[PDB]
Design an enzyme around this catalytic site. Structure first.
Site, PDB file in Angstrom:
ATOM      1  N   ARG A 156       0.240  -1.339   0.027  1.00  0.00           N
ATOM      2  CA  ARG A 156      -0.348   0.034  -0.220  1.00  0.00           C
ATOM      3  C   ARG A 156       0.906   1.405   0.050  1.00  0.00           C
ATOM      4  NH1 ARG A 156      -4.492  -1.600   4.118  1.00  0.00           N
ATOM      5  NH2 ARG A 156      -4.738   0.286   4.351  1.00  0.00           N
TER       6      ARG A 156
HETATM    7  N1  LIG Z   1      -9.703   1.982  -7.296  1.00  0.00           N
HETATM    8  C1  LIG Z   1      -8.371   1.820  -6.463  1.00  0.00           C
HETATM    9  N2  LIG Z   1      -6.994   0.474  -7.300  1.00  0.00           N
HETATM   10  C2  LIG Z   1      -6.896   0.074  -6.958  1.00  0.00           C
HETATM   11  N3  LIG Z   1      -6.491  -0.267  -5.919  1.00  0.00           N
HETATM   12  C3  LIG Z   1      -6.988  -0.483  -5.051  1.00  0.00           C
HETATM   13  C4  LIG Z   1      -8.629   0.529  -5.549  1.00  0.00           C
HETATM   14  N4  LIG Z   1      -9.276   0.600  -3.511  1.00  0.00           N
HETATM   15  C5  LIG Z   1      -8.389   0.335  -3.164  1.00  0.00           C
HETATM   16  N5  LIG Z   1      -6.946  -0.146  -3.542  1.00  0.00           N
HETATM   17  C6  LIG Z   1      -5.999  -1.077  -3.067  1.00  0.00           C
HETATM   18  O1  LIG Z   1      -6.066  -1.435  -1.480  1.00  0.00           O
HETATM   19  C7  LIG Z   1      -5.215  -0.893  -0.325  1.00  0.00           C
HETATM   20  C8  LIG Z   1      -6.091  -0.357   0.829  1.00  0.00           C
HETATM   21  O2  LIG Z   1      -6.565   0.788   0.301  1.00  0.00           O
HETATM   22  P1  LIG Z   1      -7.489   0.991   2.223  1.00  0.00           P
HETATM   23  O3  LIG Z   1      -6.703   1.400   2.674  1.00  0.00           O
HETATM   24  O4  LIG Z   1      -8.307   2.276   1.727  1.00  0.00           O
HETATM   25  O5  LIG Z   1      -8.012  -0.045   2.287  1.00  0.00           O
HETATM   26  P2  LIG Z   1      -9.424  -0.274   3.565  1.00  0.00           P
HETATM   27  O6  LIG Z   1      -9.875  -1.326   3.758  1.00  0.00           O
HETATM   28  O7  LIG Z   1      -9.981   1.043   4.257  1.00  0.00           O
HETATM   29  O8  LIG Z   1      -8.123  -0.585   4.429  1.00  0.00           O
HETATM   30  P3  LIG Z   1      -7.276  -0.655   6.411  1.00  0.00           P
HETATM   31  O9  LIG Z   1      -8.096  -0.877   7.193  1.00  0.00           O
HETATM   32  O10 LIG Z   1      -6.216  -1.320   6.276  1.00  0.00           O
HETATM   33  O11 LIG Z   1      -7.336   0.840   6.233  1.00  0.00           O
HETATM   34  C9  LIG Z   1      -4.846  -0.242  -1.796  1.00  0.00           C
HETATM   35  O12 LIG Z   1      -3.672  -0.304  -1.126  1.00  0.00           O
HETATM   36  C10 LIG Z   1      -4.845  -0.155  -2.950  1.00  0.00           C
HETATM   37  O13 LIG Z   1      -3.534  -1.824  -3.353  1.00  0.00           O
HETATM   38 MG   LIG Z   2      -6.666   2.151   4.617  1.00  0.00          MG
END
Ligand SMILES: Nc1ncnc2c1ncn2[C@@H]1O[C@H](COP(=O)(O)OP(=O)(O)OP(=O)(O)O)[C@@H](O)[C@H]1O
Ligand SMILES: [Mg+2]
Ligand SMILES: Nc1ncnc2c1ncn2[C@@H]1O[C@H](COP(=O)(O)OP(=O)(O)OP(=O)(O)O)[C@@H](O)[C@H]1O
Ligand SMILES: Nc1ncnc2c1ncn2[C@@H]1O[C@H](COP(=O)(O)OP(=O)(O)O)[C@@H](O)[C@H]1O
Ligand SMILES: [Mg+2]
Lengths: 171, 512, 460, 52, 173, 52, 458
Positions: free
Chosen positions: B375
């Site tokens: 990430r």
């Molecule tokens: N539109 C997108 N295109 C490609 N990858 C994406 C996209 N949106 C999210 N990701 C992937 O999701 C990863 C993590 O994003 P994010 O922090 O929003 O997730 P999360 O579910 O909120 O995680 P956490 O609770 O650990 O913070 C990014 O680093 C990427 O690899």
């Molecule tokens: Mg996040």
């Protein structure tokens, strides 16, 4: 091994005089406040299910009658209360305004108007907790309750006096 | 030269250092003993998190300050204790030695040395329980951490200060990948730390012996808590390891830390907590299990030069320190959706997922694209690596999905055929031997050959030979370009032209 | 002089009150006279007021409140050394056979500390079992743990006896057998089958029979382990057989539940991984000797994700799988070459020749299984010359995996054979690479070395 | 290399035999403000010397 | 063990005793109550499941030479809650509270040699510097220290023994 | 191979050092026990009560 | 005037004189070595004992420390002066800038607005992401919740919403970082400052390394600020980094407060703790709060009581799924579970409703065919079931979209798709007018134009 609300100044009062005077059985004192539950010391005459009046205009329902304690739940914002406040037991079970004038109104569970359209024009008060009509006081349900949905009104009829569960997941 | 006189002089010096005058201390008594948990009566002056000294050289940690007793846990074999033994209070909150003199030593979670080398040299103590630097003190990660393997440097790059979870089932290569990461930092100026929690002892000795065998040991600290030792020691092992890594971070240096199994630490907290009767939640862990791994891992960070200057009282100017963390989680049957794996996935900056089906098929290292992610982004990677890698990750994921449907029915439309050939050759190109690190120049040549189409006319059974011959060819003749690309990871049209000439000439002129 | 008094008796749990300055330590052993028999109690917890809570190593019936408890200042101690070979003992190191009092040169405490780091062997030797399938396909690290994944009826015990025999004769090691949670019937006839095969003089037996209380069964494993530690300290390489590790896990669960500790995971004790680590980390190769262990494993509900298998598999080095199907072929031992594995099979520890040979026979047998499905659905006509060569060499390999035991002479009548690792490697090397294609497959069956295979063929 | 340590093992322990006596006397007077005249202490340190 | 449930009764009884100044008399009353609890025939009764009223009045009949109004009423409260076995601990905590209020402390002096009166005198003066309370010294003789003096003001301990100095030195090396 | 031998040198040095340390405190123990049955105790306790 | 008498983890018990005992939620204060520590009162026990949560490190506390009774709740800086700055749970500045020049401070414990004070609006607030607007339209002044497990994109989606919503929004905004990574907040702050939009955003941070009390009360603080900007008559955007952590902090504290566990080890008061916070983040007749809340779900279990009770408190709920992210399809929204209160024929028009229901019907039928496809493969389907599968796969791919914040991962340029374009595209795909393109042409393209163009490039 645990304490049971035996605490220093209460014990000293009982040391001075074990058969403490009758005083009023009508009243007592809050000894604990937490998460909307209060423990009250005293209230020798509090009945199970009775309303307890609190400082301000607030109430609690006596749910646990224990050995020299009453557990009561507060019917409103509790966090303003404090240990050592006096409380008085009413003679009253919880009752609510009732009548034809409630039609078209929005009320809270104490029957206080919440829509802002002014005071109620109820027809007296009724007990919140009451017993249902007995077996010999029923009559069979035969009149319809028209829902207006084809599937329900055809396959799953609802009559006057029926109890029909609506069950499913969110949304 | 072994010399008796210098030992005698040292013993005399210790006699001189000793002060005979005594000091008043608050004392208490053990009241009850069970399963490493202790209940103590006395110690009116104790503080939560304090170290209590027991008879012998053993210690205990004060967990609960009850009204008339202290709840505590023994940091060692507890069976030798009995009710009534006097316990003294050292006001010291739980602490452990720190300093650069620790490099090359094997050490217990209490700071005592486990190797036969002797007593330990340290630059004071640092506290085991501390709160990590706040939001303003952090800095963005902007430098690479080049481990030996092709896949994780190309598809899941790691920057200094990043936290990346190596996750997979048992016997899938997690340990090998972590220690090969350590071994490749042997020359990159990054200090390394390895924390072994709950491993079988023979494993740990073999790991240290392999670290020595490749000369990386002089750059590592190793912290050990065997499967035989009390649960409290295991539970506190990663926190001690974290306390040592912070020393380099705060002086403007770079460090790398491995946690060998955070799942085993979670089991340890289960045992201590359930022995303290704390009500369990999902999969019988406490809700505090999120906070455990949270506050441990959140210490790993990169700090700005203003924090380094303020911390070191201005002795270091303009530098920025970092602590890079590679936690390891063992997961059952490849289930990525269990509780603790999901908690740690919610804390790291990405994860490296190793699949047992790939590993059994001989595709090693068995990195699974699509699930594995970094990430942090490409900011960790160098220019040549970032340009040459590009979409290789998603191309591999799509190749695997296409192979899934192609197994089911026959529908081949010539671009599918070439996509399949390319994906199969790339997967054969990504596999790599254990203890065989390769530098960014070699990796960039490999990626260049893969994506500029040169592996056309090359057999799958020839791919490994093609690489061996190509790296020998470039080591023989065009070495100066290798020195240049290894110094600065710069991608220019000049360097692309040189690489194009090298691959043209190799493909046309050589054999494999 | 006895100085403690029993305060409570609730099932197997017994509470005792000692004077405040003398409270016995954890895992100390205590003795009471329960009627006209002594009963040993093991201390578990030091409660307040000078009261220790114990578990009875025997029936707790007939105990009164207020009995006198005598404080032995040591844990349970058992006899060790050569005098224990060929004897049968209970948890307490008492003889349960009728051959009488043991020599008892030395008595040792079952609760002991584990080997420390600077004591571990700075090398990674292998153990030459002498059995072709095992030494080829699932080699044992010296001081490793091995898991036996087979149900009774396929030759578990004859395999165990063959290993006991070979390690006693072809090396200078002894064996210890720990019958954790064993039916009495089996114990009786395992004893008979070892005495009628002359291996009894080279093994020590401790039986925890299922009719014993949970405290007995749990500490039975530790007793066998400490006897193996004595043989290690004498400088030998030793084999310790655990008749079921799952029973040890369950005995720990039962004891933890009786004492009232909060359960964990799928209802196991909170100390599950610690208790397994306490057992398994003592079984290692030291700088004087080693203990290798072969442990029978039962997987609950056939579920390899359950905490008991999941915890046990963290410690196993090799894994031996026994097959009903292979046994039906007449092939003995009934080891399955495709599901049995060892994490010693790498070039870095075992060498490139052995690695490539094992990988080769695995590939041939797997390809043979697929070809055998093709034969089942479409007959032999579909096979090319390459396929027929693969099938033929696979059949020769499968025959060559059989072996006559010195223990099996009772049935086969053939003399037993111990096959050295080099001979096994050479045999499968040759069969894989097309040598010996000119002599029939039945020359390889139950013969021994490959030289013996060709000399069998000459008049077959 | 190991064999060379064996010769020194004995060589050095012989030196530490005689240094141990000095160290023991010095430590005793570090513990106690008053010095010791060694009237009945020679035999004590000789036993120490004999053991190492 | 009744260490934690004894505190409320000890504190309340002490405050009441102070209001009526007969603290010494209250301590006598509690000493009598603690000794009847140790009796062989009473310790059987106290463990039986008799209703508090009957059990209490048997105890009260046995507890002659107490004050009906106050002491025997403390007995009634403890009987109600089923805590008469707390009396041997309520007594100790009442004595502790008295020592705190009277600004007076009891401390132990331990040595291998029987201490001379001048040594004890200087010890008492120094301790009264360290402790605001006046001090009553208790002399204990134990060969363990081998030499020197062990000062034990309860949990606060100052070690002046040669053996302590020696086993402290052993861990420095 | 050189690294391995260096580690052995460190191990031998510490082993012998441990023996001398424990024998030194044993010797101080034996010296003190015999030599302290005097009014030297008064010297120690006087300084303690002066420091107390 | 008070003394510490027990210390259990993050929970501290303090004894006060009977006439001086603190009220509930009053703030106490302790010297912890050279530090200052704030304790918040949770419960009044018998006898002047009061039980509190440490708003800071519990390490180093002895018994017997003197505690000072500050006779008011936790109160935080509020108003236009709190804008462009980063703050502690206690309202302290955490950026290295100077004092916050606040004119007013508000207590974080407040009563919710009356039913008589509420307001309703049908105004569609367009968000660039194609899937959210078509399947779950979100109106100004309402609540939006992003549900997802670990690492499925609920932070990144919110950053795209921040970018796209800030295009057409002029007023102030508040961001509450509750129990999440410090790095995400640091990166966010520097993105805001390097684009000069920081002058309009107020930030509160309570991230996951801080002890339970901080993470519990940091959310309430952020609501206090958002309510100030509402009550000035403005319209406000409130972003909550992770509301799950708020309930989990209560879980972490709950057993130490002496309360019996409920359901899967949760606190018995869970529903009220969630409700009492949720009911005051709402619009009123004087001003309106628009809010986006990330909702972590443990172990991917959408039936767990915390996510389950969160569903009822939201207007538009977007449900992300790991199965779709693993297929490469981002943003990984599940169209068969994402829903909105605003998807009505009256609110969005008959085309907007008919297209969404056609998309759902087609996808739902795709699900029911998967078991026969799994066992027997596609050749045993009916001749129009094959067509349903083809169109469902095309629809699944066209839901994917390149984000301007995902250039750091994909490298592809980002795309913004307006409403009068996405419903046209999906209606055409449903009617089969674009059925001739291959499946891959719809992956990560902005509009139908870009799909046919990409098909020309094969
Ligand atoms: N539109 C997108 N295109 C490609 N990858 C994406 C996209 N949106 C999210 N990701 C992937 O999701 C990863 C993590 O994003 P994010 O922090 O929003 O997730 P999360 O579910 O909120 O995680 P956490 O609770 O650990 O913070 C990014 O680093 C990427 O690899
Ligand atoms: Mg996040
Ligand atoms: N690049 C590689 N090529 C071939 N084999 C490899 C490679 N890397 C690791 N292995 C093999 O993987 C096996 C297990 O390695 P490792 O100990 O790292 O696994 P693990 O999943 O971390 O194990 P455990 O869970 O027991 O700690 C070893 O046999 C090792 O040789
Ligand atoms: N090496 C062998 N030679 C001959 N028969 C064998 C051999 N191994 C197993 N068997 C047969 O398998 C059956 C069960 O053997 P047994 O030793 O009782 O198995 P287990 O030890 O699993 O109970 C017997 O009929 C035995 O003859
Ligand atoms: Mg490992």
């Amino acid at each position: 091994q645990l304490n049971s609300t035996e605490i220093s100044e209460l014990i000293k009062q009982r040391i001075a005089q074990f058969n403490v005077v009758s005083e009023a059985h009508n009243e007592g004192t809050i000894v604990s406040v937490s998460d909307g539950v209060i423990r009250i010391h005293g209230l020798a005459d509090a009945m199970q299910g009775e309303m307890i009046s609190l400082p301000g205009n607030r109430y609690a329902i006596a749910l646990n009658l224990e050995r020299d304690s009453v557990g009561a739940v507060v019917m409103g914002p509790y966090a303003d209360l404090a240990e050592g406040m006096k409380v008085k037991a009413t003679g009253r079970i919880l009752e609510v305004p009732v009548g034809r004038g409630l039609l078209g109104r929005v009320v809270n569970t104490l029957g206080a108007p919440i829509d802002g359209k002014g005071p109620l024009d109820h027809d007296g008060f009724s007990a919140v907790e009451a017993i249902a009509p007995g077996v010999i006081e029923r009559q069979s349900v035969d009149q319809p309750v028209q829902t207006g949905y084809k599937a329900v009104d055809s396959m799953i009829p609802i009559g006057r006096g029926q109890r029909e569960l609506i069950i499913g997941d969110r949304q | 030269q072994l010399n008796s006189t210098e030992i005698s002089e040292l013993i005399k010096q210790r006699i001189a250092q000793f002060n005979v005058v005594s000091e008043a201390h608050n004392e208490g008594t053990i009241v009850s003993v069970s399963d490493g948990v202790i209940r103590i009566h006395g110690l009116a002056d104790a503080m939560q998190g304090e170290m209590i000294s027991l008879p012998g050289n053993r210690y205990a940690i004060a967990l609960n300050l009850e009204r008339d007793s202290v709840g505590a846990v023994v940091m060692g074999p507890y069976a030798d204790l009995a009710e009534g033994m006097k316990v003294k209070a050292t006001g010291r909150i739980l602490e452990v030695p720190v300093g650069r003199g620790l490099l090359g030593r094997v050490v217990n979670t209490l700071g005592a040395p486990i190797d036969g080398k002797g007593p330990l040299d340290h630059d004071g103590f640092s506290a085991v329980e501390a709160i990590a630097p706040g939001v303003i003190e952090r800095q963005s990660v902007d430098q690479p951490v080049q481990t030996g393997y092709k896949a994780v440097d190309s598809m899941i790059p790691i920057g200094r200060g990043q936290r990346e979870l190596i996750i997979g089932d048992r016997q899938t290569g997690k340990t090998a990948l972590a220690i090969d990461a350590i071994i490749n930092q042997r020359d990159s100026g990054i200090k390394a730390i390895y924390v072994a929690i709950g491993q079988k002892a023979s494993t740990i000795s073999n790991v240290v012996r392999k670290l020595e065998e490749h000369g990386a040991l002089a750059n590592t600290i190793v912290v050990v808590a065997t499967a035989s030792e009390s649960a409290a020691l295991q539970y506190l092992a990663p926190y001690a390891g974290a306390a040592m890594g912070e020393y380099f971070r705060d002086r403007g240096e770079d460090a790398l830390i491995i946690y060998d199994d955070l799942s085993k630490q979670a089991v340890a907290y289960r045992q201590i907590s359930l022995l303290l009767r704390r009500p369990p939640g999902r999969e019988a862990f406490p809700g505090d299990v999120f906070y455990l791994h949270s506050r441990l891992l959140e210490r790993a960070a990169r700090v700005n030069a203003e924090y380094v200057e303020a911390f070191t009282k201005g002795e270091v100017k303009g530098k920025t320190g970092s602590l890079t963390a590679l936690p390891i989680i063992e997961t059952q049957a490849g289930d990525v959706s269990a509780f603790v794996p999901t908690n740690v996935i919610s804390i790291t900056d990405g994860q490296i997922f190793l699949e047992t089906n790939l590993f059994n098929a001989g595709i090693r290292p068995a990195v699974n694209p699509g699930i594995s992610v970094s990430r942090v982004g490409g900011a960790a990677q160098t220019k040549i690596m970032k340009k040459l890698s590009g979409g290789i990750r998603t191309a591999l994921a799509q190749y695997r999905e296409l192979a899934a449907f192609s197994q089911a029915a026959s529908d081949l439309d010539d671009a599918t055929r070439k996509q399949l050939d390319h994906g199969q050759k790339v997967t054969e190109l990504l596999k790599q031997k254990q203890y065989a690190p390769m530098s960014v120049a070699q990796q960039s040549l490999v990626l260049f050959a893969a994506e500029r189409g040169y592996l056309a006319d090359v057999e799958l059974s020839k791919i490994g030979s093609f690489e061996a011959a190509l790296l020998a060819y470039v080591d023989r003749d065009h070495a100066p370009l290798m020195q240049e690309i290894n110094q600065t990871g710069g991608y220019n049209d000049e360097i692309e032209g040189k690489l194009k000439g090298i691959l043209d000439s190799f493909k046309a002129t050589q054999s494999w | 002089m006895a100085t403690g008094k029993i305060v409570q008796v609730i099932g197997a749990v017994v509470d005792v009150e000692f004077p405040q300055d003398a409270v016995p330590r954890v895992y100390d052993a205590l003795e009471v006279q329960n009627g006209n028999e002594r009963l040993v109690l093991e201390v578990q917890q030091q409660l307040g007021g000078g009261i220790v809570r114990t578990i009875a190593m025997g029936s707790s019936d007939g105990l009164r409140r207020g009995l006198d408890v005598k404080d032995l200042e040591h844990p349970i101690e058992v006899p060790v050394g050569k005098a224990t070979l060929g004897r049968i003992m209970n948890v307490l190191g008492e003889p349960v056979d009728m051959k009488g009092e043991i020599g008892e040169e030395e008595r040792w405490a079952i609760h002991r500390a584990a080997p420390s780091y600077e004591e571990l062997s700075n090398s990674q030797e292998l153990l030459e079992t002498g059995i072709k399938v095992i030494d080829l396909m699932a080699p044992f690290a010296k001081g490793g743990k091995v898991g036996l994944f087979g149900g009774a009826g396929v030759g578990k015990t004859v395999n165990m006896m063959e290993l006991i025999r070979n390690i006693a004769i072809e090396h200078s090691g002894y064996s210890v057998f720990a019958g954790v949670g064993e039916r009495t019937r089996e114990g009786n006839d395992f004893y008979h089958e070892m005495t009628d095969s002359n291996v009894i003089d080279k093994v020590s037996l401790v039986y925890g029979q299922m009719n014993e209380p949970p405290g007995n069964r749990l500490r039975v494993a530790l007793t066998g382990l400490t006897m193996a530690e004595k043989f290690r300290d004498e400088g030998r390489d030793v084999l310790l057989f655990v008749d079921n590790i799952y029973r040890y896990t369950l005995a720990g669960t039962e004891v933890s539940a009786l004492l009232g500790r909060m359960p964990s995971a799928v209802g196991y004790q909170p100390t599950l991984a610690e208790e397994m680590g306490v057992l398994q980390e003592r079984i290692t190769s030291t700088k004087t000797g080693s203990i290798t262990s072969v442990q029978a494993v039962y997987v609950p509900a056939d579920d390899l994700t359950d905490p008991s298998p999941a915890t046990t598999f963290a410690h196993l080095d090799a894994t031996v799988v026994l097959s009903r199907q292979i046994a039906s072929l007449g092939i003995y031992p009934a080891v399955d070459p495709l599901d049995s594995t060892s994490r010693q099979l790498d070039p870095l520890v075992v060498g490139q020749e052995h690695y490539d040979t094992a990988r080769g026979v695995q590939s041939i047998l797997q390809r043979y299984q697929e070809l055998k499905d093709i034969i089942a659905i479409l007959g032999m006509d579909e096979l090319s010359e390459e396929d027929k060569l693969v099938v033929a060499r696979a059949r020769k390999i499968q025959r060559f995996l059989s072996q006559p035991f010195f223990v099996a002479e009772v049935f086969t009548g053939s003399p037993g054979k111990y096959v050295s690792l080099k001979d096994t490697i050479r045999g499968f090397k040759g069969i894989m690479e097309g040598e010996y294609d000119h002599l029939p497959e039945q020359a390889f069956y139950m013969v021994g070395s490959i030289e013996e295979a060709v000399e069998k063929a000459k008049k077959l | 290399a190991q064999a060379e340590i064996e010769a020194e093992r004995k060589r050095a322990r012989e030196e530490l035999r005689k240094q141990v006596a000095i160290l023991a006397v010095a430590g005793a007077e570090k513990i106690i403000e008053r010095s010791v005249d060694e009237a009945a202490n020679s035999d004590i340190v000789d036993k120490l010397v004999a053991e190492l | 063990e009744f260490i934690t449930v004894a505190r409320p009764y000890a504190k309340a009884a002490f405050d009441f005793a102070v209001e009526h100044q007969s603290v010494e008399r209250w301590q006598d009353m509690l000493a009598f109550a603690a000794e009847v609890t140790k009796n062989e025939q009473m310790a059987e009764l106290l463990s039986g499941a008799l209703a508090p009223e009957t059990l209490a009045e048997s105890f009260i009949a046995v507890a002659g030479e107490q004050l009906d109004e106050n002491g025997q009423n403390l007995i009634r409260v403890m009987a109600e809650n089923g805590r008469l076995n707390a009396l041997p601990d309520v007594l100790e905590q009442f004595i502790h509270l008295r020592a705190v209020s009277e600004a007076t402390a009891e401390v132990d002096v331990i040595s291998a040699a029987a201490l001379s009166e001048q040594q004890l005198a200087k010890i008492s003066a120094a301790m009264e510097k360290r402790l605001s309370r006046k001090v009553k010294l208790n002399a204990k003789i134990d060969k363990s220290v081998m030499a020197g003096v062990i000062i034990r003001a309860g949990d606060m301990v100052i070690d002046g023994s040669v053996r302590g100095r020696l086993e402290r030195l052993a861990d420095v090396l």
